[PDB]
Amino acid sequence: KSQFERAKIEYGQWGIDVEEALERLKQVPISIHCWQGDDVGGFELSGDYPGKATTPEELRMDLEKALSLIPGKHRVNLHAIYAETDGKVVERDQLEPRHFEKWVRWAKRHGLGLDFNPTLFSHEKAKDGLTLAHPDQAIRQFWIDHCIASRKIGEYFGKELETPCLTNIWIPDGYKDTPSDRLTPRKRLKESLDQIFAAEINEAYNLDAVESKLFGIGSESYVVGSHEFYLSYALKNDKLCLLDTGHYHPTETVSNKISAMLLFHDKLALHVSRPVRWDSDHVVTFDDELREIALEIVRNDALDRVLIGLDFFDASINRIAAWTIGTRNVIKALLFAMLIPHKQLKEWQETGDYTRRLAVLEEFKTYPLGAIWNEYCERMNVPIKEEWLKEIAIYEKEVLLQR
Template sequence: MVKAETVDKAYEVAKERYAEMGVDTEAAMKQLEKVALSIHCWQGDDIHGFLNPDAELTGGIAVTGNYPGVARTPDELTADLHEALSLIPGTHKVALHMIYAVAKDGKKKDFNDIRPEDFDYWIDWAKKEGIGLDNNGTFFSHPNVKDNMTVASPDKAIRDYWIEHGKLTREVSNYIGEKLGQTCYNNFWVPDGFKDNPIDKRTPRERLLASLDEIEAKPYDEKNTQDSFEGKLFGAPGIESYTVGSHLFYDNYAITRGHLWTIDAGHFHPTEDVSDKFAAYFPFTKKDLFMHVSRPVRWDSDHTVIMDEALVRITRSLVRDNYLERTHLGLDFFDATINRVAAWVVGARATQKALLQAMLEPIDQLKQAEYDADFTTRLIETEELKSMPFGAVWDKFCQNNGTPVGMDWMQNIHQYEKDVQFKRN
């Protein structure tokens, strides 16, 4: 176990080193403390939910692995989330999907039979935890996903079903936000597309546009809920060649309709730099951005987030360009090959580490060097920052927030497996 005095000694050295570069470590930690991540509930139960947990995952959704201890009930899932939140510094939110409704009568319900009150279980739990909730419509794993189409389907009956579902997600999100007294961000992602090259690329997008406008017709108080729209380059399996809801489509839709745009780090081509998107989006809208932090491996495979170069570039861009306050950060991955609670903690702490490293930069100095065309100084300082002792500041941040330092939290995971998770199988 890492000793408190060891953390303090290392931090004092790091504090002094950063001060020499004009960086206030205390201010950086205070800034990080204000960032609330939206922790995705579906990592804990492999995206089955509680409406029909035995249903096969379809619509471009797949989970691999069978590590023991998967959550099977609402109480098991919230217990796992509580454990994860206790190991992540700061106060955060939890993101739900409509399939996580907990029917009061205990009976299985169709997606469109859900009522706002079916989320009272989550609202009561969130109040106990002192956190907020976000939401997502579930446009997959249902018989009415026909030929990989939902709201863009040429079949009006299919289209109408999913339009109704979209309206319902907004009603539920408004209810959640109203009950918790904070904004519930409601994310839309739909899997519509074609496996092979389509002849008609125009009509599906016109149908999608009309469907979304119908879904969005009823206004809600933005203090309670705001909608965000998530594009995708391609999906596997089934929509490798054409995605109706592309990035450009939803970017334009969000800007012209006054909504948020969702950027998922795993939804772009592997050679695209996601961090370059922010400064190209924000100048055209007064709305915020929703960011899904995920990790693709060659495709949108939703691996557990790690502090890799892509994540570092994303957080640097948000911090350096002062877009962090306008960006809502949520996690989105699912890995059943490892302990599911550990996956949450690894992903969240990696995101926080990357943010902290970005906050521990003399940004004004670096910008001034750039404005002065002093690219030599810019290069030298950014290179030297890579070996600065930011880890000591991170350990102090964890200590200040009452969470385990370093790898100490692994002991919590192993004990939780033994006492709780492994007893489920």
């Protein structure tokens, strides 16, 4: 109120225009993933926290509860196993725009954008833990086909919703133990991708992303689609790199990659999740790396160029909370990065005044961000501070515990 007004001049002494940051913050959309809501079940025909969603309509209502507690206007990220086959078995190579018709009517209803993923796991045709890179041509051909279907589905979304859909390819391909050939399976991956992307699609409707991973449970020794593979591949073929913050080496940092991608790519894509010693997929927290990512997005004038998304899955807590704690933190960090004096911070590093650059970065860690954040929440009709938690408790009592 005036708690907010005194906070406002503290930033104004630096020439930081907070009113302006709040307009700019209003418009950045976070793509939130639907898989959190039903523990990555999907709707495919053929001891955790209670109350997950188990039907398409339960999942939608849940997405709305979370959105109603998160400020701004955002997007929903779908997986192909979220198809509504209408009680028919439809093979993955056969999924079609009319299978996601309900999702699109619902997105249009709420002003959501929509993003997409082919699903290449939990399937008969993926038991050997190889896929687009399986030695068999009929397996490889099945998954190529499905990725081509998803490309069409994504175009569908962009067509219908008037906003580019990002279709991202992730594969689980690898070997648990030491490989005796690293070159051939990657070669097949290249061929499998050359095919998947054979046909142009208007960039206004769809964009293609590839996401690497360093290792999985069951692919601990070697993953086919690696950081260097997808980097070279994306650059050569004008695709987007999707970076997941849980997908790298120990100590390995995504914030250090962003400025280097920005030099050779018009756009890139982000999945923010929290790794605790593996791609554990913990809920995102307002931590140093999260802020350091935000810093890079803002300093580098990259808000139209970094497509921000969430990737996490905690079933040990309330799932609607996961979504809300996740997104609020990533918004907080953008806000924080928006409230940094980059102009003087940058001149100090140009001039080598490392003393002030250290001093002031340090001192902004206690600048009154809560006060700005709180007001932003109030203007955007969501609960300030820990209040959103009352709303999850009602919803858990009335709705979620009844399932």
